[PDB]
């Protein structure tokens, strides 16, 4: 998260860290045994870490659970990042509590102008790389599709939505990928891609979760 602020300890209890020996992506807990992330964060073996704040220090609220089923969206296109959504079934249900809680699926697609919360342990710089220890937060509005398409000519599909600032400075970045975009208590987006990080006229692009509610539920029920 570039230009964000450090989140209060455990204030985003649905945020999870995908670990493959190191933190590589983020995700959202949608129920005691399922996490939703980005298809581009796929790895054959993943350890999901819940109740995290400081990613490099044991604080007492952590719950490390291994992924049992890693399911990428069948129509994920790695070149366009279309359908960049993935589901992870944990090997066992987690203990839900204050620092480990679920986030709601969207009942509808949020209108442009809605203020959302983005969080993650991704890169904090607009140039170069700096991975933070503490969970970063960012308050950003959902942008109009016209502005999204104008920023990325011929690359924005209807399963993508831009969130952020056209003037730059604040944005999600590598490492935040798979992470949550929560507006009014509902998961509206998933960190997917973007040109650079926090650059003017290049807002972040996110997977439009409201288009996948059915697939999510169907898959959870079928697995
Ligand atoms: Ca920790």
CATH superfamily placement of the largest domain: Trypsin-like serine proteases
CATH class descriptor of the largest domain: Mainly Beta
- The 3D shape can be described as globular
**Bound heterogens, unique:** calcium ion
N-to-C series of helices and strands: EEEEEEEEEHEEEEH
Radius of gyration: 16 Å
Per CATH, the architecture of the largest domain is: Beta Barrel
| Lateral strand order in the biggest sheet | 1-9-8-11-12-13-10
Strand runs, count: 13
Number of helices: 2
Say what the CATH topology of the largest domain is.
Answer: Thrombin, subunit H
How much strand?
A: 25-35%
Q: Structural class of the helices, strands and pairings?
A: mainly beta
Q: How far from one another are the termini? A: 33 Å
Helix content: under 10%
Question: What is the makeup of the main sheet?
Answer: 7 strands, antiparallel
Q: Write down the domain tally.
A: 2
PDB class: hydrolase
Keywords: serine protease, hydrolase, serine proteinase
Assembly: monomeric
Entry title: benzamidine in complex with RAT trypsin mutant X99RT
């Amino acid at each position: 998260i570039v230009g964000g602020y450090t989140c209060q300890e455990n204030s985003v209890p649905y945020q999870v860290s995908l670990n493959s020996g190191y933190h590589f992506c983020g995700g959202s807990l949608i129920n005691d045994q399922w996490v939703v992330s980005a298809a581009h964060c796929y790895k054959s073996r993943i350890q999901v870490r819940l109740g995290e704040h400081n990613i490099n220090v044991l604080e007492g609220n952590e719950q490390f659970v291994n992924a049992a089923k890693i399911i990428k969206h069948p129509n994920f296109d790695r070149e366009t990042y279309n359908n960049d959504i993935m589901l992870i079934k944990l090997s066992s249900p987690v203990k839900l509590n204050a620092r480990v809680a679920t986030v709601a699926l969207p009942s509808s697609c949020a209108p442009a102008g809605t203020q959302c919360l983005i969080s993650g342990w991704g890169n904090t710089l607009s140039s170069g790389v700096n991975e933070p220890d503490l969970l970063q937060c960012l308050d950003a509005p959902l942008l109009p599709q016209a502005d999204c398409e104008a920023s990325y000519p011929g690359k924005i599909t209807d399963n993508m939505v831009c969130v952020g600032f056209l003037e730059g400075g604040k944005d999600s970045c590598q490492g935040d990928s798979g992470g949550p975009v929560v507006c009014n208590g509902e998961l509206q987006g998933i960190v997917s891609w973007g040109y650079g990080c926090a650059l003017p006229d290049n807002p972040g692009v996110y997977t439009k979760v409201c288009n996948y509610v059915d697939w999510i539920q169907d898959t959870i029920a079928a697995n």
